[PDB]
Each structure stands twice: as structure tokens, then as C-alpha cells.
Amino acid sequence: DKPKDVSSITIIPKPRLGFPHGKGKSDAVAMRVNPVALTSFQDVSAYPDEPRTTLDIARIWGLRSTFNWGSGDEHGKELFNTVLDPGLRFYDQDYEGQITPMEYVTGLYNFWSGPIELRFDFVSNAFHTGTVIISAEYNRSSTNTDECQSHSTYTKTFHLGEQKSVHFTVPYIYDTVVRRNTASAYLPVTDYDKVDNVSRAQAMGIRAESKMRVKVRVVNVLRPVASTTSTIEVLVYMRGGKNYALHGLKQSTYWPSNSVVPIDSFPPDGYDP
Amino acid sequence: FSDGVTAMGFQSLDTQVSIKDILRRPVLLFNHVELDPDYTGFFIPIMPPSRMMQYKSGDKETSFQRLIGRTPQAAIMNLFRFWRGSLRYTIIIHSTDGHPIYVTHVPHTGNRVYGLMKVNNLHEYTKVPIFGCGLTTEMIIPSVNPSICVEVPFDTENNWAVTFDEDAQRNYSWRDKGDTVTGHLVVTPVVSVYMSVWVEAGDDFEVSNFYGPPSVKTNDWNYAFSDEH
Amino acid sequence: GDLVIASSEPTQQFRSLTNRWMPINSIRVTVNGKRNDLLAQYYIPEDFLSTHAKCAPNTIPFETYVYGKYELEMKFVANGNKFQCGKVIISVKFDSYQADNINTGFQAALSRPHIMLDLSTNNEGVLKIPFRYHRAFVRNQTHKTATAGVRPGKFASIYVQVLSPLQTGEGGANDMFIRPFYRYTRAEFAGMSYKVPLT
């Protein structure tokens, strides 16, 4: 017998499946004998200390900056002063160095939120002593001469002694639930082209800068013994909080410039001497 | 101070924090490149994008896309040196014609090439095609569907593959030179015709041997206005 | 997993020869050091073979065998007076062949597994260094009849760097020293052959 097939359906043809989607379903064709055969990880697999998420990369301690503190530095003087942006280090000049992992990986996402931890380690002995404060200012900056304005903001005082470290949590209070990245989401200028207001007029986004500032002041001056150094150095470590968040994948802000060479066909391209 | 409440899942239930899910999003390798039937065919090295494929200001102009270095995927692959598992390529032909284009896998041999290239410097490849040698192949027909999604397997002797090297063009020992790839993919045309190639991770893919962020540079500040005029 | 398959013959351990400690040549730490400058760097186990600790009993089995797996520990000892202050970081980097120029920063040192030595408190540091190489085994020795395709004796690099420079007081000691120790916690050896001098 040869009966007819009465069943039918309306269909919409598409070129690919799950091409934008990172997960779901795939239209993949295996270049194997057995189409269900996959690469084995029975013997050799991932190591347990390795990160699974990009947030776990943002939970690694990285040296943000360092600064010196001396016995001549009077009370009220701003030792440290910056804009705590995980987006950019500077708004006004070129950067070239070894960026923190949390600022590196934040440079991939368009949006960020949550608290940002700072750990201040002090390069000293047990015979250095003196009091400093940690200030977190929102919606406004304080005058450098006026310490009293900074005392009103969210602060944490530390007494230098035997313990030469202090943990600190920079909170997250803004008008928005999430802050967006200051740097551009797409920059096609690669070869350091001379930029004018016409070129700035056709930017992909606008640099929505932040006026949030982290400052560290002298409460009581470093009064060391004569036997030890007068001018010590402070390590300022930084990572994302345990409730840190990221969203919206975009072009990377930072990009490697140290020891980069383009590839060439091995070994036709003059490899054989 | 208070740690507060997280903002994960507040806007929407589209979490993009996973490493593999970043790596599974595709990247453009070759944008509108020619195929010459005079040669054997276009060669693609089986490796994820990284600082290897990074363009520099005022170097030799390759056939690669320039902003590959500045993609998120290459940025993640500049944190890990080890990787294992299959990869998925999406190839698109710039044609409507019936003349098919054969895509043939090559396993790990040792060499590391790309672009249109002659094999063993001959002057004829139609009578002796690479796609009819014995290797695993799948053909594209532009008239039916000019795209494809092939999945190159991990066929090599190494527990992990080398992502990147400190110098790409350094003539060091040749056996360790070949650990940057797991073989090649071959694209063979009939006539001179344009195409584009995309790369993404397979379902089975893994990275390890974490190094952390290298020395970087930026100048994005210079190409935007502030919100104070 | 890869051990039993890649080696038809069973591998041997020499716990008496391997698990003991072994010093090497010292490290001078000056006040003249800047940030991200190398005090020391080692390509293990080659720099425990050729240069430092040639005639150690730990280097007895490395003559005869041509393959092996290597899990180490490295205890570092700092000794400076209480009127100094400085920070020294030491990290490890697995399969560092043709990757010494890049990810060599103190930032990468923080990111990779490391130890953090203060030079005033005079603390010690223990680097548990497992075996993570892109093959089953690493080749032990070079040879004049061997192939020149594979670079042996390098599955990891040690990096001793200034994290923050050493500072001293008035008329203080201008430098202090650090003595590195090492030992083998899991040393398995395959491919028995005739003995050779170590490099």
C-alpha cells in the first residue's frame, strides 16, 4: 500500500539556532563518527580552587594603589584621595599598568552594583603608631582643608599599633539600583587617531562620571621612634563585595599592550633558516 | 557597615556572570574574506581567540578582525592558559549559487597556519581535492542554506592546549610550537567567492591554569564627553 | 588517571631521598629594590638540578629516570631586625614555558597562588606546588642524543618579587637575606635508563 500523508504544519525558516543565546539549544554538527560522542573529562578535569563565575574573579585581592605617610604630615591632611570607580582609574589621562582583577572584569560589563571592599595593609613595624580615618562621601565632595565635613560622612577610624592591617566595606548608596560603566561600550578608533569635538560628538555613549570619593586623613600624626623609619608605605588592596553584581556584556575597556605580536603561518613564513 | 541585599535578578532573570556562558557567545574571526579555487583552500587554526589574535597599531595587516583582542571572550582567555574540549564554528557564504563549499576537519598534525594557502606548493588541486582524501567533512550549499554550525573535536595528545605564548613569531622548538592548536579546519570552494567565519565554545569546554590580569592600556576617556558639557 | 595509562610499568617513590628538606643559594634583599623587580626566579626542577643543589641526595633519582610527576613544598625564611619594614611576595606559575615575559607582575603574583612575607616579623612561607603540565609527564634531563623538540625540566616557575620596598631606620642595616628551602611531597618516576651527570 502507498497511502497519502495528510499531516502538515506552517513553518518559519531561520538560518541559525541559538546564535545570540549563550545557552538553550544548538544546531551543531559533530565532525566525528558517533554524533553523541563528547570530549571526556573523566581523568583530567577542572581544579577545585579555580573560579566558575566572573564574580569569583572579582573576589580576588588586587593592589589598587599605594601611598606614603610621614611624621611631618600634620593632622587633617588628606593622605589618600580618589574617585572609587570600578569602571576607570582616571577620567582625565592615559592609564598604563597592572589593573586589579575586579576592575579588569568589570571593564567587560556595562552595569555594576553592590559594596566594594578595601583592605589597607601598612608596611611598618610594631614601633610605628598613629591614628588615621577612612571616609566615604556621596552626592558631594568635601574641601581638603575642612576635615569636619569628611567626619560627617560614612567613616571608620583606625588606631595603628601591633595589627598592621584593617578591613573596610565601601557601601553602595545612589539614586539608581545599578550604576553603568563610564567608559564606552564600542570604540572603533584603534591606531591612536587625533580626536576633536566632531569625533567626540559621534560617541556611542556619554561618560556618566561619578562624584563619589574615598579619602584617608590623619587623625593623630605618626609619631615613630627614632630607631625606625619616619616615612612608611601603605598598600591599598581592593575587591568586589560578596553581594557584588555585574550585567550587560560589552567591548572590553582595557586591552593588553605589553609584548603583543601578530601571528603568521608556521612554517612557510621564513621559519626554516 | 551593612553588606546589604544583592541586585542579582532584580531587573531580569538573565544572569551572564558564568565564564563558559561568556565563552559560548560567538566572535567574528574573518569579515568578508575571499576564497581562491587556485589554492587548496582557506585554513583556520583550531584555537579560541586570545592575545595571539590581538591587532597592534602599525604592525603587518592580517586578514583577522582587529577588535578581537578587545572582545570579552579573548579577555577571559587572557586569564587562563589551559583549555580542553570541542569548539563550534559558524561559517557564512556570500552567495546564492549551487556550487557547494566543502568544509573538512584536520586533526593535530603539528603545523600552525591560516588564510588561503597551497599545500606542498603544487599548481593543481581539483583532480586531487583535500576534501576527498579520507578526512571528516561536511559540505555547504548556498542555494539551500549559506550558513553552517560545525563542531571541531579535541583530537590531540595533550591533557590541555596552550592558549597563548609570550611571543607569537618566536622560532622555538617546533614540537611545542604546535600546542597552540588542535589541528585545522579547511574550506574548499569551486569559484572565487566571499565568506565570513565565527567562533564559539562547545557544550563540552573547560579552561584552567589561571594567571590573572596582565599589563593593560586604555584611552577611552578621550573619546567621550562628560555630563558637564 | 593519566599516570597508569601513559606508563606501562609502575612508577617508583623514594620517600627517604625526596621528602627531606634542601636549602639553595640565598637571596639578598636590599633597600635599593623597587616594586615588581625580581629578587629571584626558578624553572623547577631544572634550577634544583643544574645551578642550585647539584650534589644534594634529593637529586639522586633524577640521573636514571626520564619521566616523572612532581608535587613540591617550598618553605622561605626571612630574617630582619624589628627597626625595618618591607613586603616580599612569592607566587608560582604552572607550565610557564614561553610565558615568563607576560603575567609576570605583582598583580599576577597576587592572583596566582602565593605567600606574603613581612621582613620585620620574620615569618616563614609554605608554597604547596602541585603538578599541572600540558602532558602526562615532564622530561627530566636533556641529552646530546635526545630530540631537540621538547624542552625538559620546566613544568613551573617560582617568582620572588618586591611587593613593597624595604625601608630601614637611622643607621640601620642596609639589607637583609632570605633563605629558600624545598622538598618533594609526591615524586613518581617512569622510564628507567642508564645514569648521566645532571646537566
Partner: peptide, 26 residues
């Protein structure tokens, strides 16, 4: 030629990589 083919003799070894003895490469 390409200058990137070989590391110069002063800072290199027989394997054409940076010497572990040589510190000031950084």
C-alpha cells in the same frame, strides 16, 4: 629579517627563552 625570531644571546639560553639568572628583564 624579523627581529622577533630569536632572543639575543646576552639574555637567552640554548632553548631561546629568558634566562632565570637574568633579573632585569622586568
Amino acid at each position: 629579517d624579523n627581529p622577533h625570531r630569536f632572543l639575543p644571546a646576552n639574555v637567552s639560553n640554548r632553548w631561546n627563552e629568558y634566562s632565570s639568572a637574568y633579573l632585569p628583564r622586568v
